[PDB]
């Protein structure tokens, strides 16, 4: 029956870390027998589940995430790991028990001026509740005088934009990251 993983890994365009796109997979069989048959060229990282038992297991749910992040930021997308990107863009819960894949895309995410179309939120009043997608784009304040929209001195549009020129380092390059998170689906 072939559930779509041929678009969660072959789509031309994703969105940013503040706009991490979901894919709700159900009612279907997904041919797992090629995704780990690809000499996991993509960087492949499972928590709790194992690469030898994807065929013989069943689930209520398979939520399939997708976001694009800078190179050194793939440390964040795992339970227990803290810092700015988890605190402000994408929090994982500690008892999340799925598998994470990421791979490099200097192709399709980089001109010589670099794509500035990929955003990231610096700031918010609190750290995230896990798995809370936040499309909030208000003007952040953290001081004694929260004004209306007068920029300067902590009145920022917190969704600043990365640069992704292909002369950057590997820790800065754009990474194409997918979380395979997890009553029908088997193999």
């Amino acid at each position, epitope marked *: 029956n072939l559930c779509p993983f041929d678009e969660v890994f072959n789509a031309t365009r994703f969105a940013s870390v503040y706009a991490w796109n979901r894919k709700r997979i159900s009612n279907c069989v997904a041919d797992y027998s090629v995704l780990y048959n690809l*000499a996991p*060229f*993509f*960087t492949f*990282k499972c928590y709790g589940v194992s690469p030898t038992k994807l065929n013989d297991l069943c689930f209520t749910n398979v939520y399939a995430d997708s976001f694009v992040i800078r*190179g*050194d930021e*793939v*440390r964040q*997308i*795992a339970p227990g790991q803290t810092g700015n990107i988890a605190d402000y863009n994408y929090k994982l819960p500690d008892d999340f028990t799925g598998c*994470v894949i*990421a*791979w*490099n895309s*200097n*192709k399709l995410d980089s001109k010589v001026s670099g794509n500035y179309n990929y955003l990231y939120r610096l700031f918010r009043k609190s750290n995230l509740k896990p798995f809370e997608r936040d499309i909030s784009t208000e003007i952040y304040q953290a001081g004694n005088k929260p004004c209306n929209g007068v920029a300067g001195f902590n009145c920022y549009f917190p969704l600043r934009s990365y640069s992704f*020129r*292909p*002369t*950057y*380092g*590997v*820790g*800065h390059q754009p990474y194409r990251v997918v979380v395979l998170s997890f009553a029908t689906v088997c193999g």
Partner: antibody
Amino acid sequence: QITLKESGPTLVKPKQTLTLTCTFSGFSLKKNGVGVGWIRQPPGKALEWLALIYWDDSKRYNPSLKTRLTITGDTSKNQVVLTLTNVDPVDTATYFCAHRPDLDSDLIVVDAFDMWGQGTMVTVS
Amino acid sequence: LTQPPSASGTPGQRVTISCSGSSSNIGRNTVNWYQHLPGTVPKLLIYHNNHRPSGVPGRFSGSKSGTSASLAISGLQSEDEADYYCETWDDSLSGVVFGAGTRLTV
């Protein structure tokens, strides 16, 4: 289990083209997130870096050497081949093909050479 | 980049290594370190920062205070009579820029 095996001619007259090679083992360059390096060693001076082959033929060279260094990696033949022309006695060195990942299985960027080849004492005379 | 040519130390005291460069590479990207015995192969000693692979003593650590990469030696002994190299990818230079080398005497 990862091993960089390198070979090539070492007894080479000055100023023609030197082609070298390094057969990499223990991994594949069909992997993405992986580079393979080339490193100068002037004995008793320093190291300098030459070039990186990335999996999608992403092309990097040392800004001192643009035209005299062009680089190719044949993943099918499980090797990376180093090409360089018009070769000076200062280019007498030992060259290191080395493995540059970014995996670090708990997923921290490496951006570094973790495994190296032994080296070839390249001589220009 | 910029790296002092050598450093000295008796076998055991806290010995500092320094490295520096511009804001494009070391001031932005992440720093590496290497140990190279004379005549033999070099090897990685610290990658990205402060984190080491299998086979490295945990006493040696780094810091990225802007444009400064600071390898540390504590507990010196005999084996590490070697050239210590800082590299970092450069954004403008589009490549790998090594340090100048630093040999530590025991």
